[PDB]
Amino acid sequence: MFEARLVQGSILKKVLEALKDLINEACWDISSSGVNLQSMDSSHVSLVQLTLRSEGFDTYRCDRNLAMGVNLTSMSKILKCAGNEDIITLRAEDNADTLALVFEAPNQEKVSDYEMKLMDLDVEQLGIPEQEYSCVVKMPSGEFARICRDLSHIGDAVVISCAKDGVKFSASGELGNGNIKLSQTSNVDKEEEAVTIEMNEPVQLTFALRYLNFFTKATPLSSTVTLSMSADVPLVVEYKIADMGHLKYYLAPKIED
């Protein structure tokens, strides 16, 4: 039996909006430490890793470890029926044939109970090592979303160059080319508003903008985004879900022979 009660239901909603368009089906690993999820997209070019720690929920209880196969479109449909101020409780039986979602509205006269059917999925999961990256950029998530969307007008691929003093984003297509240069913030007043770069060696990689525009759907989860780059290693785009966990998108680069 698994039961977790989360007062800020909006977080769950945003998570599902950050996943439903990239991957259709995913296995949720429930354990005493919390909720974990990992899935590549259908093309295997990108990967999503979600972690929601038990300490982040208002109440958490997991007796035996569970693996719930979920169609993410169905779960997002169910969660759109929740309000941003609802208290959301997830519950599953020991056999866990279905997953129950209880939404307690802020009107205090409305309680909703949804029962989502679960299925048995055989998902390909990868071993992601914990490593140190040659270049790390921390920037406002909205600025990053705007950059990816804007450069999608210019071309299909973006070249990210992380250097000591700043980071540059490059796109090229039939109509021409463009470069956006974000210098390291000189007057760091609000840490959420700043561009900071931690570098060991400068890094330069090429990525597909369609996947990045899928990634940026996590923007409502965090005011900042962190991009981690090493040479010929897939890039990591990290949104921290405050005081609970994170959502990480991994993107394989386009490499010249």
Binding site: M40, H44, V45, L126, P129, P234, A252, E256, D257
Partner: peptide
């Protein structure tokens, strides 16, 4: 000149 896959870097397991 080639889009790589996540499996080109990480093993499945």
């Amino acid at each position: 000149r080639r889009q790589t896959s996540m499996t080109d870097y990480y093993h499945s397991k």
